[PDB]
Symmetry: D2
Subunit: 115 residues, 4 copies
């Protein structure tokens, strides 16, 4: 599990459940090709997105569908979605945990990188 | 204006208005003595808390009554309040801006010292 | 000034100066077309990106070149950049302030719409 | 484990290790009496602070010694520490996860409350 995503809800003090997450990898032609996708679990986490073998060096984009999440709660959010773009494995294989804390008009994201 | 406080609402995407703010200075006996207080304006800001002469080196605590703010909106918040404790260094011309971004179960605070 | 961007540095407790910001508007063919760009000032702010007349309803993307900012400080950041994608509603007099707080491996962004 | 604290480092993209945490409970005389304390582990977490039986309703304060953490890294931080004050178990026993994301001049804290 080299790539993990965790999403929390700052309004309800709970994990953000059933949040759609799409991951893309920048292709040779500078285009974003689908890499993996999923929905956060009851704990606000998304595991099994990829494997060490498939997760090669490159630029990846993790898109979190925050809009659909807030609309389902009856809240009109500011952002269309939350995006996290980063170069991965440039100096060897690493484990990445992408965390996002969501509010209707704000979000924070941090990364925890392990060897 | 050596010290300024700004509070934003992350739920409504607006300044946090009429939020009570209390500032304290740590006294010689390690006790918190009232220093200044006020309520954020329409722009979520609070100015004129103190002056350069009065704002001497020391440890200060800025307490933001976040609980009352959320209750007024019909939301049961997690925190009793938000506190920011810092040491005013004074070493060189410095203005302190304490910013807080509020959500019912979360808050972030940052300091901009220029 | 319908749209304003403010960037702060959470590591140095100061405004993030000379940060490149690019704004795009989603075109009819679902493509991002350049809309406006600039660099944050000494106060970490970027004004005069657009006008009320030009800033019509639509989906906009604000891209903050955070990577170049950290590299200039000798720090290897995590993100390639920070992006804020939002729909300008226009329904009623509204000014948009996009604020970003930057750290090497984290950033927070909030919108203050008044 | 009704009370858990997790601390992350936003500057290094890693858990904040060996961070001292002190917990207090507001006493009848409006005084803060020591309740529990510990240091974050290699994963930035602190477990076993208290038990369901001991964690009764009341106002608690979780103090995270962020200053010592940054000084050990050679960084002069803004805050003396980070404090989280909340009423707990007022409507029955709950599980609380207090998370903090640290930067020299900024910190964010969120709570995840479970039944
Ligand atoms: C991944 C981890 C978890 O949920 O256990 C986690 C997730 C989010 C935060 C976090 C807390 C406050 C502001 C920004 C991020 C954090 F400090 C730790």
């Amino acid at each position: 599990c080299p790539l993990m995503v965790k999403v929390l809800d700052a309004v309800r003090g709970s994990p953000a459940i059933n949040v759609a997450v799409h991951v893309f990898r920048k292709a040779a032609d500078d285009t974003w090709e689908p890499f993996a996708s999923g929905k956060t679990s009851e704990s606000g986490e998304l595991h099994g997105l990829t494997t060490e073998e498939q997760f090669v060096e490159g630029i990846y984009k993790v898109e979190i569908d925050t809009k659909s999440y807030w609309k389902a709660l009856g809240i009109s959010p500011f952002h269309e979605h939350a995006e996290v773009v980063f170069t991965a494995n440039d100096s060897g294989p690493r484990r990445y945990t992408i965390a996002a804390l969501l509010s209707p008009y704000s979000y924070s994201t941090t990364a925890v990188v392990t060897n």
